[PDB]
Design an enzyme around this catalytic site. Sequence first.
Site, short mmCIF file in Angstrom:
data_model
loop_
_atom_site.label_atom_id
_atom_site.label_comp_id
_atom_site.label_asym_id
_atom_site.label_seq_id
_atom_site.Cartn_x
_atom_site.Cartn_y
_atom_site.Cartn_z
CB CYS A 1 33.26 31.70 43.38
SG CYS A 1 34.74 32.71 43.46
CG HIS B 1 31.69 36.63 40.66
ND1 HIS B 1 32.03 36.58 42.00
CD2 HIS B 1 32.22 35.54 40.09
CE1 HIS B 1 32.75 35.50 42.22
NE2 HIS B 1 32.88 34.85 41.08
N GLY C 1 36.91 28.29 39.85
CA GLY C 1 35.75 27.42 39.99
C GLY C 1 35.30 27.19 41.43
C1 K36 Z 1 35.44 32.31 41.85
O1 K36 Z 1 35.63 30.92 41.71
C2 K36 Z 1 36.82 32.97 41.72
C3 K36 Z 1 37.80 32.38 42.77
C4 K36 Z 1 39.24 32.96 42.70
C5 K36 Z 1 39.96 32.50 41.42
C6 K36 Z 1 41.34 31.99 41.82
N1 K36 Z 1 41.32 31.91 43.27
C7 K36 Z 1 40.15 32.43 43.82
O2 K36 Z 1 39.94 32.46 45.02
N2 K36 Z 1 36.73 34.41 41.86
C8 K36 Z 1 37.23 35.32 40.98
O3 K36 Z 1 37.80 34.92 39.97
C9 K36 Z 1 37.06 36.88 41.23
C10 K36 Z 1 35.75 37.38 40.57
C11 K36 Z 1 35.51 38.91 40.67
C12 K36 Z 1 34.21 39.43 40.00
C13 K36 Z 1 35.54 39.38 42.13
N3 K36 Z 1 38.26 37.53 40.74
C14 K36 Z 1 39.49 37.34 41.41
O4 K36 Z 1 39.56 36.68 42.43
O5 K36 Z 1 40.62 37.95 40.87
C15 K36 Z 1 41.91 37.69 41.44
C16 K36 Z 1 42.57 36.40 40.96
C17 K36 Z 1 42.05 35.67 39.89
C18 K36 Z 1 42.64 34.48 39.44
C19 K36 Z 1 43.78 33.97 40.04
C20 K36 Z 1 44.32 34.67 41.12
C21 K36 Z 1 43.72 35.86 41.56
#
Ligand code: K36
Lengths: 296, 296
Positions: free
Chosen positions: A147, A43, A145
């Site tokens: 991931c 992603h 950030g």
């Molecule tokens: C990659 O760094 C990121 C890590 C998430 C962001 C906040 N805490 C984490 O563990 N991953 C994502 O943003 C992910 C991407 C999709 C294409 C799977 N989306 C996600 O995790 O959505 C839920 C969420 C986002 C932001 C804050 C809390 C939950």
Amino acid sequence: HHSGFRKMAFPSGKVEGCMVQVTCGTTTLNGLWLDDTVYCPRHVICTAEDMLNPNYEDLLIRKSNHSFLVQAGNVQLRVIGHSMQNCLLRLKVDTSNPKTPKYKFVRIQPGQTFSVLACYNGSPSGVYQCAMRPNHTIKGSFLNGSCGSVGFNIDYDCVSFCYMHHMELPTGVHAGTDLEGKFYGPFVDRQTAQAAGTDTTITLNVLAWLYAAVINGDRWFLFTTTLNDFNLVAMKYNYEPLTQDHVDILGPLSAQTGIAVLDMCAALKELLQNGTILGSTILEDEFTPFDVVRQC
Amino acid sequence: HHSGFRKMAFPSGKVEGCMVQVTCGTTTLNGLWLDDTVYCPRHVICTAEDMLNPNYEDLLIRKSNHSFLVQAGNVQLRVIGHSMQNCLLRLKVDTSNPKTPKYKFVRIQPGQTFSVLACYNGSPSGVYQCAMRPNHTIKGSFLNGSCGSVGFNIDYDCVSFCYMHHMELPTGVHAGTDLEGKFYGPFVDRQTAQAAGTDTTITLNVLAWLYAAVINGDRWFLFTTTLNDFNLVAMKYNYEPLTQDHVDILGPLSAQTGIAVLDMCAALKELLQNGTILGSTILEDEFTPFDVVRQC
Ligand SMILES: *[C@H](O)[C@H](C[C@@H]1CCNC1=O)NC(=O)[C@H](CC(C)C)NC(=O)OCc1ccccc1
Ligand SMILES: *[C@H](O)[C@H](C[C@@H]1CCNC1=O)NC(=O)[C@H](CC(C)C)NC(=O)OCc1ccccc1
């Protein structure tokens, strides 16, 4: 008496030398650099809007080797190949990482623990100990950030990579893949509501940890029981049922303490049916029998 | 909701490259190798019997450069100088450590936190987060062979070494020195009963941590109070009194949450006078305001 028993992560230096920053457009996350390959979550190719429902095959057709900016500290690594491997990208680079440790990829099982090197913008930030939950989530500490941060175990000279981080679920727990890119559990890398199974407590680890309390001097929580009676209690309280395999696993701890596994089960039974131990006013289930021993 | 807030250690790789094994006779412990100096606890020169009441000046007269076997993995470093520096030996060696990071020595204050790289036979084993207690002990995880393990903080490129491990007290907590060899607190490196002051709870960290619970969604524990009334409560419950300096320190956290420091103090007051928050059924006092922020 202070036992000192606590969650401990593996030394992270072998993994720190493998972390890079991967940017594609305005999305930035972490990559793992091993030999001449960089692995990162696929992603990275998503924009904001894409992540709600991404067509990964389609988004990737619009990318080229030169779309991925890979940074190892100051150096820029030249991407000479890119392909999708399940929910990861495999980015081939011109430079083999001289800091590549001896390593292997392992798919861990629920109940097993590992260390997480939390990274941001390609730079390691902190290290902590996690477990794969029975419902295939992990209760991590991840922010935007993070991931591409990885989980690992070290055995002697060898790093066993078991986790790469992708997402946070609505309950605040986390989901990700092994290093072959395959999600643990039923989760997919899309930002839509997804539910984890209800999460069971890891009985084998609770028992091991109640042993540690005994090895450290505590015993206020010590009747006996049988396997089938304990499993009746376990089903009531959302604990995993005990098997003879688990009893055998606990063998060593049972010797050192001269306490019968099933006697410990009876202690746990009262605690569940009734209601501190090594500090926590609750039952720790993210210490394996292995961890309890290594630490004694 | 799983907050993910948890104890996190610094990445340890910069410190791992500095750990050696130091043996003198049949005593083996860890040393820290920086430039052409190896630091270790001076009780490496003790036998079993010596440690009950050691005459260090006298034991050292019986040693020579060639009495100290210093091992960095496979290599043996040649000792070309030895001297006592407070409760450490400073062993000059023929080889400057090529893995020496940018670093400094810092004497930390009570309430401050640091990471411990626990080592055995010169090999790093695990990493975890600790605090210097108001009574100058630390609640570590140390076994036989762990002396010479170090505590540290990392700020950007620079390691600030603040602790080297020497001993365990009868209550199970731990005592040691800064890297100039000076004990924290009133302790001395002799294996006789020594008592730590009664240990106060670090109010500033409890407050910061109660803030984190609010930043993570919890609030069941939120009346107001004054500084002098809270300090009256704090004295009753063996908490450190609050100062305006601490109030200022908490400023940032207070903004983010839009909660008054003294309102948080009133919450703490009820909790003490009455009796979970981010999991613990008790009040965590080994997170600084710094740590709570870095982690958000
Ligand atoms: C990659 O760094 C990121 C890590 C998430 C962001 C906040 N805490 C984490 O563990 N991953 C994502 O943003 C992910 C991407 C999709 C294409 C799977 N989306 C996600 O995790 O959505 C839920 C969420 C986002 C932001 C804050 C809390 C939950
Ligand atoms: C150095 O590795 C060692 C570490 C102790 C041993 C067990 N846990 C620790 O933190 N230090 C000593 O053995 C120390 C040496 C004196 C010259 C100060 N003596 C000591 O700590 O005695 C108390 C004790 C020993 C063994 C088990 C529990 C407590």
